[PDB]
Ligand binder design. Structure first.
Ligand SMILES: OC[C@H]1O[C@@H]2O[C@H]3[C@H](O)[C@@H](O)[C@@H](O[C@H]4[C@H](O)[C@@H](O)[C@@H](O[C@H]5[C@H](O)[C@@H](O)[C@@H](O[C@H]6[C@H](O)[C@@H](O)[C@@H](O[C@H]7[C@H](O)[C@@H](O)[C@@H](O[C@H]1[C@H](O)[C@H]2O)O[C@@H]7CO)O[C@@H]6CO)O[C@@H]5CO)O[C@@H]4CO)O[C@@H]3CO
Ligand SMILES: OC[C@H]1O[C@@H]2O[C@H]3[C@H](O)[C@@H](O)[C@@H](O[C@H]4[C@H](O)[C@@H](O)[C@@H](O[C@H]5[C@H](O)[C@@H](O)[C@@H](O[C@H]6[C@H](O)[C@@H](O)[C@@H](O[C@H]7[C@H](O)[C@@H](O)[C@@H](O[C@H]1[C@H](O)[C@H]2O)O[C@@H]7CO)O[C@@H]6CO)O[C@@H]5CO)O[C@@H]4CO)O[C@@H]3CO
Ligand SMILES: OC[C@H]1O[C@H](O[C@H]2[C@H](O)[C@@H](O)[C@@H](O)O[C@@H]2CO)[C@H](O)[C@@H](O)[C@@H]1O
Ligand SMILES: OC[C@H]1O[C@H](O[C@H]2[C@H](O)[C@@H](O)[C@@H](O)O[C@@H]2CO)[C@H](O)[C@@H](O)[C@@H]1O
Lengths: 649, 649
């Protein structure tokens, strides 16, 4: 057996890990399958994609086209259906009819061998006719065969009868394919919509309490849910809900020693009261949690729980499984670190003495929470545990429960970030927060919407408890408005951490990305009512963004994205499409100064001619414009951060 | 069972066809193996390359280094030995000693836990000692262990005793490696020196005849061999040596109808006198050929025969194997083409009726010529026969005869060119002749010396019978001098077609790359003696170039190559290295005007400091200079094309 087939079909993409891990999609998502296809000699080739579902059934006729002239790179768009493990193959073949046609068009006017040429075409068309199941379509091709062979008619007339639109239409649907050659199948893991698309809201239940009982419970924290669903979110991400240790507990503002009433950091998991399978007694009981989850569901909210594989010094594991920790020679366990950040309040796990015990327990924990309706886990700092540990765990859980979604909070280097997604994390946190210029934003989203989309699905949290960017610190409310538009229009999954709406932007100190008086170390009650009546919240903008996303398929996908040029460095423009839905966005990245610019649209990239002028609606205001090749915009910070326009049908 | 190992080692390179075809080397050739290596958490990793020979034996300790900070990309150089099929693995591991050292250097001055830290280092070094086979080296590490544990000594003193050069030296050779993880093996095909390195001379024996018998024979053509060996060539490439057909024979200057004396084109193979396994009767017999090959061998010349899988209309195959041709409905066979070039004098082979019969016969033919000492085949237009056909043929021939070398004359698109090498062609013709500007030359050689060197070995023919470039037509002798220098210094294989030395540069007409009165269609006798006495030949330059190549290992490899900047667009500078041999070349690409420029050497890329001034010798003249960071040159066309300098040790 040779490595190349009769008709070379090489380097099929997408490919992950040389085919050892699957490429990714979700239900209804489209993406481009490509390959390098060519043949010996000078005759024409064709190619098509054969997409096979989990039961092995082939999809529709999906012909490919060469993507640029002389490159021999071919592509076609395919669309995932139901969830599960799919496969894709590229078939390449000689296209003798295209070849003949080319030669005929030249030879026949030139009077060169007209009878031999026309007979050769007749025999090609007959072979094509012998495969066509339709009787009418067969009749049509035999009628052309007859015409081609009618030696009483003029050459150019005979030929023209084989080149009619209705002959072309038959041949486009049922082409004569010589020497069909296939690649080896590549795998596609198709998952549920939410893996790609969803809006996320993070908050700490404990901060939503009362004057009598400041430490909120699941019963009191439930009252925040309706407001969260009303802002248009689909997922509520909770920090750790377990008991919190006392030894080395952190006080307010990341101070080393807690005082008597300090609540500590939820990520310092575990005490004599319980570990990762338990509920912090101040939040209530498992039954209260079930109530929280039921009420979330009725509002169309799924819960994502935080999963942090680490322990406070008081976690039961410390004495029950000492070999899950690395001990120094005096028996002590060094506290966890991410230099120059220190986590004095927790111990890191050691994985190499009892990897089987750790796997078994981890998945029991996850299954416990799964039995209570948590189908989405936000995994804390996954890059500080072994990659192969996550690979085995996710495989074990998705083996019985494929719907479960894991989000990797890996703010680390590219290689680890990529690899974590490739070994099975459905979603990933990203570098979004550190992309604020037009050049940074354009470069990064080109990367994320390109080849990386075959393995990574990004979750653009405009802020987190650990990340308050200088852009927001220095920008104020207009900056919060911009970042919200960007996140919500550039990724089909975005998120905010509670307080973002209120434009909280006081840092711990100059040049830090920590908040001052961070909610990680203290209860942080918020006057939601006042903010709403005094209009000091960007909650209405947030709500509108999620509505626009729910109303526009283009914003619920990642891969179709194009950046259109402008004459201003502060002003950025882009478009996204899904079927006939097209969304066009123009953002002023300057939060302090009004910017006026000219936006030059790539009209073909919108599916229009250059001279066309088509109507749009700015969905933020309801206002209408007529836009084309070049357009003046004027964006005043505070009044408008951006135009988020749909192209009107 | 997981795809990722305990310590991630990913995307090992070189890789060809995802591991389905081997990466390439020759004996004594060095190249970089790389991989992406990292781990969970913050501790250090290390990595090494394990090269395994055909009998499975591991090479030496070959430690890798990260190639750029923060990239997680690691590399080391390896060197191929004997010929055959090898394998390479990258091993990745935790490097606990580097990690410990880092922490110690900080903690010990800071007075933090000095006893615990020093004991932890002691126990690492003890484990390191248990692996070390050397007794002296073991003693050295245990002495450090003792020092580290000597609680009577100052902390910083204890530490310093574990960081001495002689401790480092032991640890560099025998490191403590945690959690060793390997990539899956990748294949390497190591072939003989001539596959990469060699100088080629093409001529037509029939042109070297006598006044009585103008049509030269193998006996008369042999007289040219001594002069070819004296110019320093290693390989003589002969056009087809078989009988030439009569039907549709071409006349002089590619005219359609031959007249009574016209000899025709050697590529129009076959007549009633014989086919591809026969000798043209006007060249003599097989015994005469044996004499030619024997005399070539005594002069250190190997012969490459042309292999052109195509027929004249009078080849016996036409009636013996009609199913090896495609016949039109009237029974005729369309003559071969490469549009807009037509080959009326030959029929192309059809491969799909009797592929097995074509394979069997092709390899019998090659083996015939092999039994007569032809161990190199120049394959004519391989891209017009199926890629899998070439794969099967080369594999069959190299299966029994691994020393045989095949050169692909595929002047075609990148995909086919790349693939033909990857399926087993040892060498390839290239775009060299159409790369004449500094930008073209720099770009193309960066490509050839980069990733493509894992599968493709280039053969830079400065001219061929089918390619007389405009640069030579418009440049005259100074152009010939430049192109020679380039070809000979940029590739470890180069070549010329007879008459190049005489600066023959008259095209068929303006804007053609054909020679006027081309040797393909006529006997072309040359007064070699007169040209030598009158100095109208660049044979002395050619000879000097081949001597320089024979005297300098740097020019017998491809992959080590760097372009140094200059302030003149017409002047190009580059360097190549192999061990302590460094060659530096500066060429004036302008054949009409003197050019003066400043050449700014990347001194580190030469292995020197910026301020250093190294002596060089221009090997073309014998003159000596002292060169460094910035150097004035002045290059007068006709007097000097280039400086070809060796850096003096
Ligand atoms: O006949 C049309 C063509 O004519 C002229 O081209 C010259 C050229 O200027 C000469 O130097 C020489 O070209 C060499 C190249 O130097 C050499 O690299 C190689 O070419 C290969 C390319 O390097 C490789 O990329 C590929 O080319 C593709 C290419 O990527 C595509 O873009 C596409 O090319 C089109 C051109 O864009 C288009 O403008 C025109 O080209 C003119 C050109 O302007 C003019 O100066 O047509 C082509 C579309 O067919 O297609 C090609 C694939 O065919 O592969 C090629 C080699 O196949 O080899 C050539 C010559 O052997 O010679 C040409 C004239 O022969
Ligand atoms: O001196 C340290 C460092 O401090 C400052 O970094 C800022 C930065 O300006 C902020 O925007 C943000 O950084 C983000 C990045 O925006 C984000 O991309 C990501 O960074 C990743 C990179 O994308 C990726 O390339 C890789 O980084 C490697 C890098 O390729 C290496 O070249 C090497 O970088 C060195 C730099 O040459 C040097 O400038 C300095 O870095 C500064 C930085 O200039 C400055 O603005 O030192 C490093 C050598 O340590 O190393 C890194 C790997 O460490 O992976 C990173 C992943 O981090 O994420 C960061 C935030 O993590 O925040 C930082 C504040 O630290
Ligand atoms: O109590 C443990 C630890 O939690 C925090 O750090 C988290 C952080 O919030 C996550 O976003 C990510 O960086 O992982 C960290 C560890 O789980 C606190 O900020 C930290 O001070 C605290 O010690
Ligand atoms: O005899 C056929 C054909 O020979 C020449 O074309 C060659 C060319 O020289 C080869 O090196 C390569 O390109 O393939 C061709 C045929 O094998 C002549 O140039 C041409 O006129 C002639 O028809």
């Amino acid at each position: 057996p040779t490595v190349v087939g009769r008709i070379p079909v090489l380097d099929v993409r997408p490919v992950v890990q040389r085919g050892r891990r699957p490429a990714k999609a979700v239900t209804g998502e489209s993406f481009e399958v490509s390959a390098t296809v060519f043949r010996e000699g000078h005759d024409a080739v064709g190619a098509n994609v054969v997409l096979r579902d989990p039961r092995g059934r082939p999809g529709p006729w999906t012909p490919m086209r060469e993507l640029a002239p002389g490159t021999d790179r071919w592509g076609a768009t395919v669309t995932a259906g139901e969830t599960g493990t799919w496969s894709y193959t590229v078939e390449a073949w000689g296209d003798p009819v295209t070849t003949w046609r080319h030669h005929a068009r030249i030879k026949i006017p030139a009077g060169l061998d007209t009878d031999l040429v026309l007979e050769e075409g007749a025999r090609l068309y007959e072979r094509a006719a012998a495969d066509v199941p339709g009787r009418e379509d067969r009749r049509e091709l035999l009628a052309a065969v007859d015409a081609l062979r009618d030696e009483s008619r003029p050459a150019a007339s005979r030929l023209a009868a084989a080149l009619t639109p209705q002959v072309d239409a038959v041949l486009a649907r049922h082409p004569l394919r010589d020497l069909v050659t296939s690649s080896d199948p590549l795998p596609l893991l198709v998952e549920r919509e939410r893996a790609l698309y969803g809006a996320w809201y993070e908050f700490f239940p404990r901060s939503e309490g009362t004057p009598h009982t400041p430490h909120g419970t699941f019963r009191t924290a439930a009252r925040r849910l309706p407001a969260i669903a009303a802002m248009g979110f689909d997922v509520v991400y909770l920090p750790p809900i377990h008991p919190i240790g006392t030894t080395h507990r952190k006080g307010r503002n990341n101070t080393l020693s807690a005082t008597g009433d300090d609540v500590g950091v939820p990520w310092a998991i575990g005490s004599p009261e319980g570990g990762h399978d338990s509920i912090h007694p101040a939040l209530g009981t498992l039954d209260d949690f079930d109530h929280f989850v039921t009420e979330a569901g009725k509002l169309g909210l799924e819960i994502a729980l935080d999963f942090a594989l680490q322990c406070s010094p008081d976690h039961p594991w410390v004495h029950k499984h000492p070999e899950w920790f690395h001990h120094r020679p005096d028996g002590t366990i060094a506290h966890a670190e991410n230099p120059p950040k220190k986590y004095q309040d927790i111990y890191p796990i050691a994985f190499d003495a009892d990897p089987d015990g750790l796997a078994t327990e981890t998945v029991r924990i996850l299954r416990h929470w799964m039995d209570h309706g948590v189908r989405i886990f936000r995994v804390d700092n996954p890059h500080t545990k072994p990659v192969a540990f996550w690979e085995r765990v996710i495989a074990d859980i998705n083996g019985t429960d494929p719907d479960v979604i894991f989000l990797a909070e890996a703010f680390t280097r590219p290689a680890m970030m990529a690899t974590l997604a490739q070994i099975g994390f459905q979603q990933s946190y990203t570098y979004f927060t550190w992309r604020n210029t037009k050049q940074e934003l354009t470069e990064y989203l080109t990367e994320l919407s390109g080849e990386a989309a075959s393995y990574m699905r990004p979750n653009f949290f405009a802020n987190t408890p650990d990340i308050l960017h200088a852009y927001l610190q220095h920008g104020g409310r207009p900056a919060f408005e911009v970042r919200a538009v960007l996140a919500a229009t550039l990724s089909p999954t975005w998120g905010i951490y509670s307080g973002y709406e209120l434009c909280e932007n006081t840092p711990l100190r100059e040049g830090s990305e920590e908040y001052l008086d961070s909610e990680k170390y203290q209860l942080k009650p918020r006057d939601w009512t006042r903010a709403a009546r005094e209009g000091t919240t960007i909650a209405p903008l947030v709500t509108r963004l999620n509505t626009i996303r729910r109303e526009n398929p283009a914003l619920r996908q990642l891969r179709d994205l194009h950046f259109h040029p402008t004459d201003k460095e502060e002003v950025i423009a882009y478009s996204k499409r899904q079927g006939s839905n097209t969304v066009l966005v123009v953002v002023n990245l300057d939060p302090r100064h009004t910017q006026e610019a000219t936006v030059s649209l790539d009209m073909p990239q919108l599916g229009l001619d250059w001279h066309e002028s088509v109507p749009v609606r700015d969905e933020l205001t309801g206002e209408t414009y007529h836009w084309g090749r070049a357009n003046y915009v004027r964006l005043e910070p505070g009044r408008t951060p951006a135009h988020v326009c749909t192209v009107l049908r």
